[PDB]
Symmetry: C3
Subunit: 87 residues, 3 copies
């Protein structure tokens, strides 16, 4: 079991990603309760980074499964698969 | 032996958390010597994130101890337990 | 196989560090394609953080191998060992 954490704004919002048994899930905080995010993909290791473009949040999640890393992107309209490739 | 690293401010300040043999400890840099920080909690895995608000720094450290993630909060007066819960 | 991710600026730039087979390598995005960065150092675990001084990027990569963490710095003039020491 392995986690990644990011945050933004002043509230703040927090996202914590968890790799456990080859699935990555997301728990979210935006100032009230912790809830379950829409992020649900394969991998046994995860890292993440985020940035604001004005008020809009952008997140990149790096999900590693079987020796390969997939980038997942949030840009205000669901999780999309990104262009990242490895060595 | 696993690390998480965070930073803030113009200096910057840096914090590096290490999980080594089920304990998580902290080394700190504020613009001069590294020193050992107040953080000491149980875990084999650590992730962390931080933000500023009105010139004060807030840190959330996520400590995992087998099947369970525990949030630790720094808000300027000691490490307190946070509301984070997993899936 | 384990990763760390950082990002900066408006484009933004992203750097993803991957620890595998006791070597850490780096994949980079600056607004066009992904490329292989200059960073190449030993370690089985990796964490990273960064900040901008104006427009100038500073990166700190914490590479852990042999039960020991070495801080690697990017400050505009290649990758150098930093003053970080552990417990
Ligand atoms: C970043 C994103 O957050 C969640 O997505 C929901 C989104 O959260 C807002 C949040 O309310 C703000 O306070 C925060 O500053 O920004 C985030 C991102 O905009 O809020 C929108 C509504 O405005 C929507 O509820 C998003 O829901 C998504 O997840 C749902 C269930 O959790 C549904 O699956 C829906 O289809 C999704 O689009 C997280 O859910 C998400 O995974 C990201 O972490
Ligand atoms: C941070 C640094 O980035 C890469 O190094 C190159 C550096 O990248 C710029 C980038 O072009 C900008 O868009 C970005 O905003 O900032 C970074 C850092 O200034 O740019 C310089 C030229 O200004 C140079 O090309 C750096 O290349 C170095 O790595 C190369 C391999 O990809 C070659 O080895 C070259 O000889 C090196 O100077 C990363 O490669 C690097 O590891 C750092 O991550
Ligand atoms: C944010 C915290 O940093 C360190 O605490 C510092 C204290 O040790 C002391 O030096 C005061 C006085 O300026 O600064 C504090 O920031 C850590 O010890 C602590 O765990 C937090 O990381
Ligand atoms: C910032 C960029 O966003 C999307 O375009 C991804 O396809 C890229 O890999 C990068 O993450
Ligand atoms: C930003 C919030 O700070 C405290 O209230 C914690 O208990 C929450 O879980 C969250 O970390
Ligand atoms: C910001 C600082 O940069 C250099 O002076 C390093 O040697 C320190 O360890 C620290 O990372």
């Amino acid at each position: 079991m392995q986690t990644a954490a990011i945050s933004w704004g002043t509230t703040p919002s927090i996202r914590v990603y968890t790799a456990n048994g080859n699935k990555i899930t997301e728990r979210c905080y935006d100032g009230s309760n912790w809830y379950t995010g829409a992020f649900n993909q394969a991998g046994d290791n995860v890292s993440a980074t985020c940035w604001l473009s004005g008020s809009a949040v952008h997140i990149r999640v790096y999900a590693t499964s079987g020796g390969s890393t997939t980038e997942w992107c949030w840009d205000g309209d669901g999780w999309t698969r990104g262009a990242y490739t490895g060595l």
